[PDB]
Amino acid sequence: QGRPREIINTYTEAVQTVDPFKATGKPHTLWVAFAKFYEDNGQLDDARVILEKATKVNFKQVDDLASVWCQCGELELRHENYDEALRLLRKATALPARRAEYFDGSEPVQNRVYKSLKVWSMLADLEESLGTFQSTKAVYDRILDLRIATPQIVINYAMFLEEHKYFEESFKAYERGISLFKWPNVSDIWSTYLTKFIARYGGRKLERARDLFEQALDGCPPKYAKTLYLLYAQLEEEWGLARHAMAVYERATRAVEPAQQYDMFNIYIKRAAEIYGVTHTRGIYQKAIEVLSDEHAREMCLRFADMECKLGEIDRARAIYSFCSQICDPRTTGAFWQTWKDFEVRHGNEDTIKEMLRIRRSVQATYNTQV
């Protein structure tokens, strides 16, 4: 009622709430809104007394305190020139450094990463517009979290790279990302920043870059979908060494598809296709036929079977057909048997030697059909 102006009086009644009871964040948010009504009241008049009165509530142990001080920092960003906003935001931002949270309440821990890192980020190193970020301000934010924080880990490492751009910020970003959160949550961003920082800092085609990249991601869970290879496997293949590329192709082939996806299977068969030669495709055929989920061994053994029959002799086609009898549950199918029989007819069998192939294939299908 009469919010912008009525008597230029009732705004005090709007700021009048009282009724002390148990509340979290309501008197602080309504006190910041009352500080905006104080901004329409003549700005700095009565505003500093409201910020100082609402700045101390019990001893720490609240997220509304630093949120109201940070809100006063945003009103200080609305204050144009950053001299006084940087002084008052520097002292008010430096106050939580001595004591943060965890005095009494329902919060088991202090959790000063959000609020404290927000006040430290509003004071310096915003990574957007405002300047005046000292070379030690990044360490002041990392020390503001004091254990680990990774909402801003990408932006924090980007700010440390803006102020420094060296390997120390990359290693500190890798340690802060590893200790930040378990599993490739912030560790995946630590891997991307480890490859980009490995190329732009540690040097191209460096052994220590592959040693650290392979050391941190060694065992790993399957990332987002899975990547155990393409970064380190492609980086090793592009490093100029045709030897270690094959070793990283086999070691990458063991961890290739934990989900038994045909993607990594075609990536390993293609990696063995573009390098080495026939014998490598045969070893990849036996290795692809060894690992089996449902259709994996049938499709891989069929493709490598046709590729081997079109190049090598017909022994791998007959033995590959016998291997196709023990796998590839009948379902419907019927095309692979006629295609294998026609391929055997084109191999010089015709009348002879095809009676056991067709009679054995039909006898195997009838035997698999049960009754």
Binding site: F167, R208, D211, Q215
Partner: protein, 189 residues
């Protein structure tokens, strides 16, 4: 038991008797090597109190461990953890990153094929003066002539490339290039 007493004493605040009891217990239990015993407590109290002197002393005592530095990956991941925590970046931590477990595993590969010699040459790219490069080239030259036809020809090109890089490192076509031409006379077919 030392990790349990260090954890309970860690949640007990204090840590003076936990560190003194960690060094005293690590001294009385020392027989062959510390490995997961003292290094885990030294890294726990180290990273807990954020002390570089304890990390340097732990890294110095870990380098004196016998039995191939006790557990390979343990001391490697611990030295990389305290390394990356304290300084890391380049220079010291880079050379030590190529050294220690990397230089030992790449140092002794139980030579079989030319890939291990190529890795020893990659780690030997920047190591010492031309004496070590000539020792690695002469050590890998006679290490694997596996056969007459095929392979060893590429191994002969590997010995000619190792002698060409080692001889061409500090000089330009020295007498070692003439000796590499004598080795290029193909005692093979």
């Amino acid at each position: 038991n030392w990790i349990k007493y260090a954890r309970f004493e860690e949640k007990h605040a204090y840590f003076a008797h936990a560190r003194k009891v960690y060094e005293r217990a690590v001294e009385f239990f020392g027989d062959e090597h510390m490995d997961e015993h003292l290094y885990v407590a030294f890294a726990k109290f180290e990273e807990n109190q954020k002390e570089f002197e304890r990390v340097r002393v732990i890294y110095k005592y870990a380098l004196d461990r016998i039995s191939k530095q006790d557990a390979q990956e343990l001391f490697k991941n611990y030295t990389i953890f305290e390394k990356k925590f304290g300084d890391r970046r380049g220079i010291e931590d880079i050379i030590v990153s190529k050294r220690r477990f990397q230089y030992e595993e790449e140092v002794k590969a139980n030579p079989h094929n030319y890939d291990a010699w190529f890795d020893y040459l990659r780690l030997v790219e920047s190591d010492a003066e031309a004496e070590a490069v000539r020792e690695v080239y002469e050590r890998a030259i006679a290490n694997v002539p596996p056969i007459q036809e095929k392979r060893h020809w590429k191994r002969y090109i590997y010995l000619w490339i190792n002698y060409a890089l080692y001889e061409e490192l500090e000089a330009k076509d020295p007498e070692r290039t003439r000796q590499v031409y004598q080795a290029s006379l193909e005692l093979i077919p």
